[PDB]
Amino acid sequence: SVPWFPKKISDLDHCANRVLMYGSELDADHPGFKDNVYRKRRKYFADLAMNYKHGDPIPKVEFTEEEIKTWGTVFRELNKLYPTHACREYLKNLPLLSKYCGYREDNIPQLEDVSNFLKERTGFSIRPVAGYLSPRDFLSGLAFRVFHCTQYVRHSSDPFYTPEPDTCHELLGHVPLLAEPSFAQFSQEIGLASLGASEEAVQKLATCYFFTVEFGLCKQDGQLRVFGAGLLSSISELKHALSGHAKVKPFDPKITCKQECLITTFQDVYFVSESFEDAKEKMREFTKTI
Numbered sequence: 001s002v003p004w005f006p007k008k009i010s011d012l013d014h015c016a017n018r019v020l021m022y023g024s025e026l027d028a029d030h031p032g033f034k035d036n037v038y039r040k041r042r043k044y045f046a047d048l049a050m051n052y053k054h055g056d057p058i059p060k061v062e063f064t065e066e067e068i069k070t071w072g073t074v075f076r077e078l079n080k081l082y083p084t085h086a087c088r089e090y091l092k093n094l095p096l097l098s099k100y101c102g103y104r105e106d107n108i109p110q111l112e113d114v115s116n117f118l119k120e121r122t123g124f125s126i127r128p129v130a131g132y133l134s135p136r137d138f139l140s141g142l143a144f145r146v147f148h149c150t151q152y153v154r155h156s157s158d159p160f161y162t163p164e165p166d167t168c169h170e171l172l173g174h175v176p177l178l179a180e181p182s183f184a185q186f187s188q189e190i191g192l193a194s195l196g197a198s199e200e201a202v203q204k205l206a207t208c209y210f211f212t213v214e215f216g217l218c219k220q221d222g223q224l225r226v227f228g229a230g231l232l233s234s235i236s237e238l239k240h241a242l243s244g245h246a247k248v249k250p251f252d253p254k255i256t257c258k259q260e261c262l263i264t265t266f267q268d269v270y271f272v273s274e275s276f277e278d279a280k281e282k283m284r285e286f287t288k289t290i
């Protein structure tokens, strides 16, 4: 039978809180595990997401000096690499978001503002989420041009901590490209193809999403550059991917979907997409076979 899937944007209310990883619960190994203040703050952000319902303006938060400084360091360091490492489509959009949404070393952009900016640009919107959802639920959000986004900030003790993703990853890694029409269309189609799809189908779509939206590379003027959100928000993997150390292959769904998605370590191989339009076309051909 066909598993339950949202039929309208408000139906996301029925899966947005199905958090399987991260969230308010911090493990003993977490940088802020022994920080009482941080623990309560994470519960706060988690509650804002759990209580959120479609149609609500996303609760705005007055970030602390510590959170702003942590964001500043992450933003400062990554921005030093973008000019020479990021794909032109990213470089064209980050400045846009920054101007209209307040991306500054001393100011964390509010999700509601980013959501409204995206709504007018590509129809994409943001929904705050406590933690990571299942691939099926997260992808179902894309079908309605909704990107579930974390709102909390990594612990200040280690601004370069990536094991657990946070709002910096969302704002710097995922958001800019959602302002690009072709990228937004590509993302929505992955979501639409996943609705009510089989487990095997969702797994394959999730993998293609992983090697494009999350860790995709482009080749511009013969130079390898990154567009994957996981690369754009990670200093270490950002450099690793563009070094001759990593294996690189052309994006090809039938093959790319066979690749295992790694966590904790660098990917065994990164895939290069010719353009967002071409990646979209390749996925159309692929989905017709699954």
Ligand SMILES: C[C@H](O)[C@H](O)C1=Nc2c(nc(N)[nH]c2=O)NC1
Pocket (backbone or CB within 6 Å): 129, 131, 132, 133, 134, 135, 136, 138, 139, 148, 149, 150, 206, 209, 210
């Ligand atoms: C998209 C792919 O399925 C990936 O494994 C997932 N990413 C995310 C997720 N959930 C959230 N909130 N954010 C993500 O980026 N669930 C699953």
Ligand SMILES: [Fe+3]
Pocket (backbone or CB within 6 Å): 169, 173, 174, 214, 229, 230
């Ligand atoms: Fe991500």
